């Protein structure tokens, strides 16, 4: 299991490296956009022409590499925490027989060690791990909210906020109130950043909650 997860780790390092090195060396230009240096580091795209140039910047390479990085560190830390919680419990045989197949990671690590966590507040009471259950669900919520900005892109939101601006300018007793900053939707590269920020905040908070609650619910 340590072999297999070390090769998963190698996959993560090599792939994050691939994305980042590819964005660094294609930062000055490529065959699809040889004038990329003139557009700066962070720019949205180069339009739909030439087939489509979504996420072509080196910033976008970074932004996808943060996903692959968080995946890589999630692997290294899942490996660490399960190996160590099985060492601390005593049953190293659990990891040695269960780390070689992924339903062992889903059952004997994520499902098993998250019982005392998600029972931080049940209908009939709560315990000291209530904050970690709440933070667990909070990290889930923002990790999912990042998907709004990553999956759902602009254009739908500008054409929504146009309707909202109409409604505010035609709603009685709110024509009195008018913005000073015209409420546009988030920019594209900005929304990739915001989705990545929600995503990473949720990743980090979720795993912090799970890794502290499970390791503090029993303490080895």
């Amino acid at each position: 299991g340590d072999f297999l997860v070390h090769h998963a780790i190698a996959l993560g390092l090599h792939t994050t490296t691939l994305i980042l090195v590819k964005g660094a060396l294609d930062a000055r230009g490529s065959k699809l956009m040889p004038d990329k240096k003139d557009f700066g580091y962070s720019f949205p795209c180069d339009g739909p022409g030439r087939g489509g140039t979504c996420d072509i910047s080196a910033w976008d390479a970074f932004y996808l590499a943060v996903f692959w990085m968080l995946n890589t560190i999630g692997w290294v830390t899942f490996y660490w925490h399960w190996k160590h919680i099985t060492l601390w419990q005593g049953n190293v045989s659990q990891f040695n027989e269960s780390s070689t197949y992924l339903m062992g990671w889903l059952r004997d690590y994520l499902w098993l060690n998250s019982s005392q966590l998600i029972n931080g507040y049940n209908p009939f009471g709560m315990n000291s791990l209530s904050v970690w259950a709440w933070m667990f669900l909070f990290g889930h919520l923002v990790w999912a909210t990042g998907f709004m900005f990553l999956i759902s892109w602009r254009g739908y939101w500008q054409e929504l906020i146009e309707t909202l601006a109409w409604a505010h300018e035609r709603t009685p007793l709110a024509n009195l109130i008018r913005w000073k900053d015209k409420p546009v939707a988030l920019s594209i590269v900005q929304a990739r950043l915001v989705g990545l920020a929600h995503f990473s905040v949720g990743y980090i908070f979720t795993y912090a909650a799970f890794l502290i609650a499970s390791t503090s619910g029993k303490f080895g």
């Binding site: 590819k22 489509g52 072509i56 999956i151 892109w153 594209i188």
Partner: protein, 742 residues
């Protein structure tokens, strides 16, 4: 008049167009300059409105395509009936339809997959099916594998028949536009003949086959020594001993003495206590009455003679209090746009599929369906997903109508113009009610989480806390529990037992639909459902209304229905197309139907499904934890997702290992989709050009130039893998759980 209006041999049957690929268009019938050619070939494969710009050829194409789809459905039915014939325990299920898992699939013992053949029961090692086909076959009185085999050969015959019919109605003798554009005849026939005589002949089957055989099976009879249906038809003494109403004949019918036919066409409301399904006498009376209804309904429109209605004559003469001067021109757009009709028909067909799910869980029409909890869960889940998908397709095709098949110059409608004019009021108020609903449902859930985490369960939204009781649904349950006594005296019991009363139709050690209570959690989750539905409607109706023009892109109908964007300008126009709106409404349909089926599975596993003891107290699967745990998201994570997904992780080993496997793989593909939704074509094209350099350096450069997926195609692949992985995760979870507990 409504003539036949066909032409002979419009298209030559040949494999010449099989050879040249992408023949059906101008920009694809040249050959692959790139690898985008393949994707654009499959994408525009059934876009018949793009191939040929006339409704005649389009209509012939979709007609023969419907014939191909019917051939496929008949072939699939032949497969199911045949797998029920030769690869099933249908006899052993008939002998004991409470402890024998319905199984009609056996795997081959090759790489250890033979363990998927489980101890379902009946001396049979196979996969426990969940299609409820065994329940249909007991509702039809089959009782033999010979009958399943011969109807499988018949369905193969009908598949060949439909394939030949598609070939004939495209290539040899195809209708022209005067045949499709007449719709009074199409409606008259699809009402009186398809749905009218269809229900009539099914009522005939039931009156002559299902009722006697099911009465015999309910009385207790080995299905081998049961008389065949043709013995009930021919031997009058037999069916007369079953129902003496047959002894008089049809002079009860023709003299309108139907009161004596109330031995086999009862209005006996409620469920059959012996088998947990509905009363097949009630169902035979149902299909008969529905046949009379649709038969008198299919004589409403004027086709060829003087009597009838014109749909144009109705719509152009329908003045009323709220914009009744409109409705003029709808006969024009609906008889000249297949996309309008496809949108409308998909909307109503998907809503009917959802109605079907909701009426099959609660009024289980087949015998021993309510106690096969896998069958009930799978049917509700399935038809819910199908309904949501079909509604989202209604969106897609409403949008495709709005872009392509919409001409205010020729085909003008007052109502659609009035909707497009104030469309911003529509989307603004719908956005508002979506925000309001998201808050006052999900924020109630968040308040519950916070209060239960702060140790303040007195401040939660629950029955033991601040109560948000569904007074209206509770009142409806109170009425319908008391309906058959005063309002519907012809019914001895209520239409369903989900309302209330001392009615709990257990067939064995299983419940089968006790009265479902409605507490604070049901209010909360029903408002979550209204919420998710309203957000789906927001996204989809918004794409529909803004398919043509907006304040952002006033020339969107020139860009097309399915285009990525209009560039990063105007801040950005990334998902401005109507295609992008249906692509997002797919995610929201996923969220909606997933929380719907979660509500269903938990509510039934906590308040309905369970065991019944010899003392008379019911022990549910989860144990009534829906009213206290399904008020918090931590309870959905703990008492539902973490708790019920124990059987799918312990599935490894027993038959359900595949459901274990299909859990994780589904978990993967969903995540695999996130490679597509989050990313963009530019990065992947540059990675591909580096790999193309690596291939040019070995003389292995392809001629079909490798291009990253189209932006729209990246989004399509993303939403496709996302729906597949999420839905297959839920399918594995549901089926493993409910086959391992009930």
């Amino acid at each position: 008049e409504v003539k036949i209006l066909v032409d002979r041999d419009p298209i030559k049957t040949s494999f010449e167009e099989w050879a040249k690929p992408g023949h059906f268009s101008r920009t694809i019938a040249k050959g692959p300059d790139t690898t985008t050619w393949i994707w654009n070939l499959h994408a525009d494969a059934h876009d018949f409105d793009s191939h040929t710009s006339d409704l005649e050829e389009i209509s012939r194409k979709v007609f023969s395509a419907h014939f191909g789809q019917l051939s496929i459905i008949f072939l699939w039915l032949s497969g199911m009936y045949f797998h029920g014939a030769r690869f099933s325990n249908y006899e052993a299920w008939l002998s004991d339809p409470t402890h024998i898992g319905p199984s009609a699939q056996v795997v081959w013992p090759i790489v250890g997959q033979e363990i998927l053949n489980g101890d379902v029961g009946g001396g049979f090692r196979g996969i426990q099916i969940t299609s409820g086909f065994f329940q249909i076959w007991r509702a039809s009185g089959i009782t033999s594998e010979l009958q399943l085999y011969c109807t499988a050969i018949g369905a193969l015959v009908f598949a060949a028949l439909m394939l030949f019919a598609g070939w004939f109605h495209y290539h040899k003798a195809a209708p022209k536009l005067a045949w499709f554009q007449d719709v009074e005849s199409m409606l008259n026939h699809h009402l009186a003949g398809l749905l009218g005589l269809g229900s009539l002949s099914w009522a005939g089957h039931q009156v002559h086959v299902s009722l006697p055989i099911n009465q015999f099976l309910n009385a207790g009879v080995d299905p081998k020594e049961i008389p065949l249906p043709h013995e009930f038809i021919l031997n009058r003494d037999l069916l007369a001993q079953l129902y003496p109403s047959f002894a008089e004949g049809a002079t009860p019918f023709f003299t309108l003495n139907w009161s004596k036919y109330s031995e086999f066409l009862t209005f006996r409301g409620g469920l059959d206590p012996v088998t947990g399904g509905l009363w097949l006498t009630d169902i035979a009376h149902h299909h008969l009455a529905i046949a009379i209804l649709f038969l008198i309904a299919g004589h409403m429109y004027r086709t060829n003679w003087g009597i009838g209605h014109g749909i144009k004559d109705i719509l152009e003469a329908h003045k009323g209090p709220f914009t009744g001067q409109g409705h003029k021109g709808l006969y024009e757009i609906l008889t000249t746009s297949w996309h309008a009709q496809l949108s409308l028909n998909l909307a109503m067909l998907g809503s009917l599929t959802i109605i079907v799910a909701h009426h099959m869980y609660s009024m289980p029409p087949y015998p021993y369906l309510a106690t096969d909890y896998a069958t009930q869960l799978s049917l509700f889940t399935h038809h819910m997903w199908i309904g949501g998908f079909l509604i989202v397709g209604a969106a897609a095709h409403a949008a495709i109508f709005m872009v392509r098949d919409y001409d205010p110059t020729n085909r003008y409608n007052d109502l659609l113009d009035r909707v497009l004019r104030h469309r911003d009021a529509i989307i603004s108020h719908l956005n508002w009610v979506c925000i309001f609903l998201g808050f006052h449902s999900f924020g109630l859930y968040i308040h519950n989480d916070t209060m239960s985490a702060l140790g303040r369960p007195q401040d939660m939204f629950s029955d033991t806390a601040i109560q948000l009781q569904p007074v209206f649904a509770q009142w409806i349950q109170n009425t319908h529990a008391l309906a058959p006594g005063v309002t519907a005296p012809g019914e001895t019991a209520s239409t369903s037992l989900t309302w209330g009363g001392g009615e709990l139709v257990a067939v064995g050690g299983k419940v089968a639909l006790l009265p479902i209570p409605l507490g604070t959690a049901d209010f909360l989750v029903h408002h979550i459902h209204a919420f998710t539905i309203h957000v789906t409607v927001l996204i989809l109706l918004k794409g529909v209304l803004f398919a043509r023009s907006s304040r952002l892109i006033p020339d969107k109908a020139n860009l097309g229905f399915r285009f990525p964007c209009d560039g990063p300008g105007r801040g950005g126009t990334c998902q401005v197309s109507a295609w992008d709106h249906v692509f997002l409404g797919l995610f929201w349909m996923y969220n909606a139907i997933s929380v719907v089926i979660f509500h269903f599975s938990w509510k039934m596993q906590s308040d309905v499904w369970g065991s019944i003891s010899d003392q008379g107290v019911v022990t549910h699967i989860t144990g009534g934890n829906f009213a206290q745990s399904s008020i918090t998201i931590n309870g959905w994570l703990r008492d539902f997702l973490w708790a019920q997904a124990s059987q799918v992780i312990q599935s490894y080993g027993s038959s359900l290992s595949a459901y274990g496997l299909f859990f994780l793989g589904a978990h993967f593909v969903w995540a695999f989709s996130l490679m597509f939704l989050f990313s963009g074509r530019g990065y992947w094209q540059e990675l591909i050009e580096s790999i193309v350099w690596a291939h040019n350096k070995l003389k292995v450069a392809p001629a079909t130039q490798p291009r990253a997926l189209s932006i729209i195609q990246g989004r399509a692949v993303g939403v496709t893998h996302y729906l597949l992985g999420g839905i297959a995760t839920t399918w594995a979870f549901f089926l493993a759980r409910i086959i391992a507990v009930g």
